Amino acid sequence: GMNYLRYSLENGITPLHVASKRGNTNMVKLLLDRGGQIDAKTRDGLTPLHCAARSGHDQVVELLLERGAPLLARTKNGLSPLHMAAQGDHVECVKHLLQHKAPVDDVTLDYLTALHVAAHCGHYRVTKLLLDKRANPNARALNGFTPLHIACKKNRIKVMELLVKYGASIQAITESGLTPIHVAAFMGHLNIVLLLLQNGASPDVTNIRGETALHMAARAGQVEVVRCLKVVTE
């Protein structure tokens, strides 16, 4: 009900992988010019472009892309290089990838877009860039979690404000009928609850088991949120 990740977010190692992770642009060039395999995959399915993007080496990223590295390559769990750049708040890497036609709402095997990933990590900067590149702020991951549901679960206040400002649905429900305020209330995230209430969220909506956010917060023993919702309603 509260989960959107199946496992975690998440030999075969070649010299291109190592130089790309270390951001050594000249060596990557040399390895490429001598025939090295630009799309070699590790045991987990990582390409050199994954390694450069996960580590934030934007000029290695740019060089790899310019040389035809496949930006659609995904790991065993479905992470593309865009997902890994978002994981590390690597804005310029995200810029280069989107500039080379990377799909903004590419999904992993848990159905997460890069925006889901930035929300999960609380990366305000890449969140804003993805939203400006028409990332869908209501994209549905595993169990119907939108990026706003994720930011509310993880207590990402700046991210949630960004998503709300860009049209994330305050009333969207997961597959158990949890609204964002249900999620934030169950998790004891008092300031998130107040931001949703301030942005029009109904404290009275019920989940499929018939519980309000107040009922969920009390079930979870969240003293601060229980007091707040009692003050706001009673």
Residue numbers in the entry: 883 to 892, 1265 to 1488
Provide the authors' original text about this structure.
Ankyrins are a widely expressed scaffold protein family, which mainly function to link great varieties of functionally related but structurally diverse integral membrane proteins to the spectrin-based cytoskeletons. Each ankyrin contains an N-terminal membrane binding domain (MBD), which is composed of 24 ANK repeats and responsible for binding to diverse membrane targets. Following the MBD is an unstructured linker region of ~130 amino acid residues, followed sequentially by a ZU5-ZU5-UPA supramodule responsible for spectrin binding (SBD), a death domain (DD), and an intrinsically disordered C-terminal tail (CT) with varying lengths. We identified three distinct autoinhibitory segments from the intrinsically disordered linker and CT regions of AnkB, and elucidated the inhibition mechanism of these segments by detailed biochemical and structural investigations.
First, we mapped the minimal regions of AI-b and the corresponding repeats from MBD responsible for the interaction. Using the scheme described in Figure 2E as the assay, we mapped AI-b to a 32-aa fragment (aa 865–896) from the linker. Using a similar approach combined with truncations of various repeats, we mapped the AI-b binding regions to R6-14 of MBD. We determined the crystal structure of AnkB repeats 8–14 fused to the C-terminus of AnkB_AI-b (aa 857–896) at 2.35 Å resolution. The AI-b peptide binds to the inner groove formed by repeats 10–13, covering a large portion of the target binding ‘site-3’ (repeats 11–14) and a small portion of ‘site-2’ (repeats 7–10) that were defined in our previous study. The structure is also consistent with our biochemical data that the autoinhibitory interaction mediated by AI-b partially inhibits the binding of Nav1.2 and NF186 to MBD, as both targets use the ‘site-3’ of MBD as one of the binding sites. The electron densities of the MBD_R8-14 bound AI-b only allowed us to trace residues spanning Gly883-Glu892. Although residues Glu865-Asp882 could not be traced in the crystal structure, this segment also directly participates in binding to MBD_R8-14, as deletion of residues from 865 to 873 significantly weakened AI-b’s binding to AnkB_MBD. The structure of the MBD_R8-14/AI-b complex reveals their binding details: Tyr886 forms a hydrogen bond with His374 and hydrophobic interactions with Phe399 and Ile404; Met884 inserts into a hydrophobic pocket formed by Lys407, Val437, Phe440 and Met441; and Arg888 forms a number of hydrogen bonds with the sidechain of Tyr365 and backbone of Leu363 as well as charge-charge interaction with Asp364. ITC results showed that single point substitution of Tyr886 from AI-b with Ala significantly decreased its binding to MBD, and Met884Ala, Tyr886Ala double mutations totally abolished the AI-b’s autoinhibition.
